[PDB]
Symmetry: D2
Subunit: 115 residues, 4 copies
């Protein structure tokens, strides 16, 4: 699995479950084409977005729908979503984990990239 997303909730100290994630790839004409989407599981993970074959070099945007997450918990958060944008596979295939840690007015995101 070359692209995985892991999301944690900093208020509850738990996985962030049922978080919607939309992945896009920057096209030849410079716009963002839909690439993959899904929702985090009970462990706050999202696997199976793509395949090695499909996940070619390019600029990708991983959009994490943080607002919908907080709103469903009664919280009115600051951000609309958390967007993570990166060049992938430009030195050959790598495995990427995009981790996000969420609070209503703050988030962090870290990439763990392995070869």
């Amino acid at each position: 699995c070359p692209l995985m997303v892991k999301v944690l909730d900093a208020v509850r100290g738990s996985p962030a479950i049922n978080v919607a994630v939309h992945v896009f790839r920057k096209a030849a004409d410079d716009t963002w084409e839909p690439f993959a989407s899904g929702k985090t599981s009970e462990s706050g993970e999202l696997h199976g977005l793509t395949t090695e074959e499909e996940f070619v070099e390019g600029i990708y945007k991983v959009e994490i729908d943080t607002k919908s997450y907080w709103k469903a918990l009664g919280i009115s958060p600051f951000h609309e979503h958390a967007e993570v944008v990166f060049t992938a596979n430009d030195s050959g295939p790598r495995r990427y984990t995009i981790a996000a840690l969420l609070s209503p007015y703050s988030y962090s995101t870290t990439a763990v990239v392995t070869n």
Copy 2:
């Protein structure tokens, strides 16, 4: 000054200086219209982006050119940039970003 940006460098423990920041407002057609831009000062801050008159309710995007920052330091970064997207609803907004090569955090400090 209704909107301020503060950027920090977590490798060096310092303000991130000369970091380009572009702000956009979302238009009725769902595109991002350029709104404000500048480069962070010696204190890692960018003030004077707007005025209260100009900064009406709406969805804004603040794009922080983190890639160029790291490149200038000779360090290979992960992200193309850091994007911060939020609705301005009617005080003073401080968007802060703490930068590392493969990680960043962003926090909104909203005050009167």
Copy 3:
């Protein structure tokens, strides 16, 4: 003002006000001697902890009473406190802390 503390609340997007902070210096016997303390202001800051004369090289601990902060808000936190331990080596040190109930980050901004 060689040592400043800044505390932020990541749930509310605000300075963390009235947060008690205790600073200690490590003594020759490896114990922590009380050094400075105060409570954060309305801007989440604590200034005037020391002077340059007093703030000699050595290992310091800054303890931030995060548990009491959350309790006062009716929120159940994880940590007993946030501890920040570092060697002062000879400028101006700003210890910043971003607080959430089950998470915190701390950053040193060291400048001239």
Copy 4:
């Protein structure tokens, strides 16, 4: 495994490997008794510190030896170590993961607690 530690390196975007971790428990006489120790693996994880039986209620300190980590990489970091202090198991047994994300002048730590 009721207590696990996971450490990531924010400069390299990788697990933080061979990080020394020392765990202490606050004693009856108010001092910190050694409780467990170990080092993170190639995945940046440390399992097997304790057992359910041994990990009774108490105040614990997880000390992460961040300085030694950075120094071994040629970096002179700000902090001596990252200390995480918490009451454990005071509402019955829980599983705790103490995650730390490291940069030379900054770190964050998050607890994920499951029942």
